[PDB]
Design an enzyme around this catalytic site. Structure first.
Site, PDB file in Angstrom:
ATOM      1  N   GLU A  12       0.701  -1.089   0.073  1.00 13.72           N
ATOM      2  CA  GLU A  12       0.195   0.012  -0.141  1.00 13.72           C
ATOM      3  C   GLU A  12       0.915   1.297  -0.085  1.00 13.72           C
ATOM      4  OE1 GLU A  12      -3.367   0.643  -0.124  1.00 13.72           O
ATOM      5  OE2 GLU A  12      -4.351  -1.076   0.429  1.00 13.72           O
ATOM      6  N   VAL A  18      -0.752  -1.244  -4.217  1.00  8.58           N
ATOM      7  CA  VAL A  18      -0.055  -1.794  -5.409  1.00  8.58           C
ATOM      8  C   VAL A  18      -0.156  -3.200  -5.825  1.00  8.58           C
ATOM      9  CG1 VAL A  18       2.218  -1.972  -6.491  1.00  8.58           C
ATOM     10  CG2 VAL A  18       1.635  -0.128  -4.681  1.00  8.58           C
ATOM     11  N   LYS A  33      -0.370   0.002  -9.814  1.00  4.84           N
ATOM     12  CA  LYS A  33      -0.843   0.815  -8.867  1.00  4.84           C
ATOM     13  C   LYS A  33      -2.085   1.733  -9.202  1.00  4.84           C
ATOM     14  CE  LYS A  33       0.913   4.360  -5.646  1.00  4.84           C
ATOM     15  NZ  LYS A  33       1.657   5.835  -5.359  1.00  4.84           N
ATOM     16  N   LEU A  76       9.769  -5.514  -9.460  1.00  6.11           N
ATOM     17  CA  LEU A  76      10.916  -5.996  -9.143  1.00  6.11           C
ATOM     18  C   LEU A  76      10.610  -6.851  -8.016  1.00  6.11           C
ATOM     19  CD1 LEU A  76      11.634  -3.133 -10.532  1.00  6.11           C
ATOM     20  CD2 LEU A  76      13.990  -3.657  -9.306  1.00  6.11           C
ATOM     21  N   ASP A 120      10.566  12.130  -1.263  1.00  6.56           N
ATOM     22  CA  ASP A 120      10.116  10.900  -0.339  1.00  6.56           C
ATOM     23  C   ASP A 120      10.737   9.430  -0.150  1.00  6.56           C
ATOM     24  OD1 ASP A 120       8.668  10.100   1.919  1.00  6.56           O
ATOM     25  OD2 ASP A 120       6.897   9.811   0.922  1.00  6.56           O
ATOM     26  N   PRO A 123      13.278   3.389   2.708  1.00  8.78           N
ATOM     27  CA  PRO A 123      13.772   1.946   2.352  1.00  8.78           C
ATOM     28  C   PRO A 123      12.534   1.368   1.463  1.00  8.78           C
ATOM     29  CG  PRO A 123      14.407   2.400   4.413  1.00  8.78           C
ATOM     30  CD  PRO A 123      14.091   3.619   3.884  1.00  8.78           C
ATOM     31  N   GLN A 124      11.437   1.471   1.766  1.00  8.00           N
ATOM     32  CA  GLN A 124      10.341   0.819   1.293  1.00  8.00           C
ATOM     33  C   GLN A 124      10.002   1.090  -0.240  1.00  8.00           C
ATOM     34  OE1 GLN A 124      10.179   2.552   4.079  1.00  8.00           O
ATOM     35  NE2 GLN A 124      10.193   1.001   5.663  1.00  8.00           N
ATOM     36  N   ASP A 138       8.420   4.997  -7.237  1.00  5.61           N
ATOM     37  CA  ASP A 138       7.607   6.271  -6.735  1.00  5.61           C
ATOM     38  C   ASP A 138       8.122   7.693  -7.242  1.00  5.61           C
ATOM     39  OD1 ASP A 138       5.334   4.857  -5.959  1.00  5.61           O
ATOM     40  OD2 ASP A 138       5.353   6.006  -3.772  1.00  5.61           O
TER      41      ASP A 138
HETATM   42  O1  LIG Z   1       6.269   0.894  -7.851  1.00  7.03           O
HETATM   43  C1  LIG Z   1       6.212   0.378  -6.832  1.00  7.03           C
HETATM   44  N1  LIG Z   1       6.528  -0.846  -6.623  1.00  7.03           N
HETATM   45  C2  LIG Z   1       7.075  -1.591  -7.482  1.00  7.03           C
HETATM   46  C3  LIG Z   1       7.088  -1.628  -8.857  1.00  7.03           C
HETATM   47  N2  LIG Z   1       7.762  -2.467  -9.237  1.00  7.03           N
HETATM   48  N3  LIG Z   1       7.737  -3.379  -8.327  1.00  7.03           N
HETATM   49  C4  LIG Z   1       7.355  -2.936  -7.139  1.00  7.03           C
HETATM   50  C5  LIG Z   1       7.322  -3.710  -5.914  1.00  7.03           C
HETATM   51  O2  LIG Z   1       6.587  -3.374  -4.823  1.00  7.03           O
HETATM   52  N4  LIG Z   1       7.941  -5.003  -5.953  1.00  7.03           N
HETATM   53  C6  LIG Z   1       7.831  -5.790  -4.810  1.00  7.03           C
HETATM   54  C7  LIG Z   1       8.351  -5.541  -3.661  1.00  7.03           C
HETATM   55  C8  LIG Z   1       8.483  -6.258  -2.543  1.00  7.03           C
HETATM   56  C9  LIG Z   1       7.941  -7.503  -2.533  1.00  7.03           C
HETATM   57  F1  LIG Z   1       8.187  -8.328  -1.557  1.00  7.03           F
HETATM   58  C10 LIG Z   1       7.541  -7.868  -3.946  1.00  7.03           C
HETATM   59  C11 LIG Z   1       7.475  -7.237  -4.821  1.00  7.03           C
HETATM   60  C12 LIG Z   1       5.734   1.304  -5.219  1.00  7.03           C
HETATM   61  C13 LIG Z   1       4.483   1.964  -5.553  1.00  7.03           C
HETATM   62  C14 LIG Z   1       4.034   2.627  -4.551  1.00  7.03           C
HETATM   63  C15 LIG Z   1       4.791   2.568  -3.455  1.00  7.03           C
HETATM   64  C16 LIG Z   1       5.864   1.764  -3.311  1.00  7.03           C
HETATM   65  C17 LIG Z   1       6.468   1.211  -4.489  1.00  7.03           C
END
Ligand SMILES: O=C(Nc1c[nH]nc1C(=O)Nc1ccc(F)cc1)c1ccccc1
Length: 283
Positions: A12, A18, A33, A76, A120, A123-124, A138
């Site tokens: 989220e 997401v 997203k 990713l 912003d 690490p997330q 992001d």
């Molecule tokens: O674009 C975002 N995320 C991603 C784009 N491509 N992959 C991701 C993603 O979150 N992959 C992911 C991350 C952690 C997992 F355990 C498994 C898969 C995003 C959007 C809003 C806030 C944070 C990240």
């Protein structure tokens, strides 16, 4: 959206869910997203399609339909916050920490050179693959526009009410992420804005007109702030070597005009021996 099958929730963001998804036609697995549409966001978002860099999560498509907003990103498999928790016991080996820092500075130097700030970093929203890569996610979503949004990586000029702040804010956040990788403890874990400000003050000294000209004239600055003395870096980030410490100190300069740019950081002697190790990740 009709061309997509949600396989699972992968997070989220600030800006809506997401999803991991698969494109019913292309086959491609993607990050989807759902935002939450004023033409201003439509416009900014469209700019982002163009700013492509190997260390920026690729924005595949911007679907604006039924008056709702979806962004399709490259997928990713893990984020840096999970990887860090996973590496709590041993810590991330320094040569891998250094590679990550180095690649992120490359992404920021790219963004900053087109005048786009992230604003912003945390690490997330730093995403990693099996081949040693780390990417900014992001990007741009903040200009364009629940738990607490974390304050832990926020630059002090933001905290002091500066409304027209610079690319130096991303440099600050990245320095806080750097220290946290090395120590395995968050640098400034603030749970309110004052607490966040005062944690910075306690480590780095309450800023004054000597180290930050103009600090006292800032919107949310008060003369009644306590006056803490600066702590020594050797106490802040053991066991980072003197080059890493010199770099970090420059990334954590109070005065945004003194603070190192991403471009000049790439030149710092800390990186003289950089490599690209591949992480061990268990997906
Ligand atoms: O674009 C975002 N995320 C991603 C784009 N491509 N992959 C991701 C993603 O979150 N992959 C992911 C991350 C952690 C997992 F355990 C498994 C898969 C995003 C959007 C809003 C806030 C944070 C990240």
């Amino acid at each position: 959206m009709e061309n997509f099958q949600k396989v699972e929730k992968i997070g989220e963001g600030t800006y809506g869910v997401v999803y991991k998804a698969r494109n019913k036609l292309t086959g491609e697995v993607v990050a989807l997203k759902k935002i939450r549409v004023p033409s201003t966001a439509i416009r900014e978002i469209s700019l982002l399609k163009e700013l492509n860099h190997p260390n920026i999560v690729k924005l595949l498509d911007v679907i604006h339909t039924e008056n709702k907003l979806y962004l399709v990103f490259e997928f990713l498999h893990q984020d840096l916050k999970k990887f860090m928790d996973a590496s709590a016991l041993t810590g991330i080996p320094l040569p891998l920490i250094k590679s990550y820092l180095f690649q992120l500075l490359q992404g920021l130097a790219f963004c900053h050179s087109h005048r786009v700030l992230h604003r912003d970093l945390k690490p997330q929203n730093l995403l990693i693959n099996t081949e040693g890569a780390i990417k900014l996610a992001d990007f741009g979503l903040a200009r364009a526009f629940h738990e607490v949004v974390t304050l832990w990586y926020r630059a002090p000029e933001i905290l002091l009410g500066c409304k027209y702040y610079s690319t130096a804010v991303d440099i600050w956040s990245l320095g806080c992420i750097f220290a946290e990788m090395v120590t395995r403890r968050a640098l400034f874990p603030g749970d309110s804005e004052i607490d966040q400000l005062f944690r910075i003050f306690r480590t780095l000294g309450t800023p004054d007109e000597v180290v930050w000209p103009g600090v006292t004239s800032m919107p949310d600055y008060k003369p009644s702030f306590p006056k803490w003395a600066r702590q020594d870096f050797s106490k802040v980030v053991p066991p980072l070597d003197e080059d890493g410490r010199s770099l970090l100190s420059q990334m954590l300069h109070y005065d945004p005009n003194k603070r190192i740019s991403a471009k000049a950081a790439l030149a710092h002697p800390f990186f003289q021996d950089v490599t690209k190790p591949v992480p061990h990740l268990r997906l």
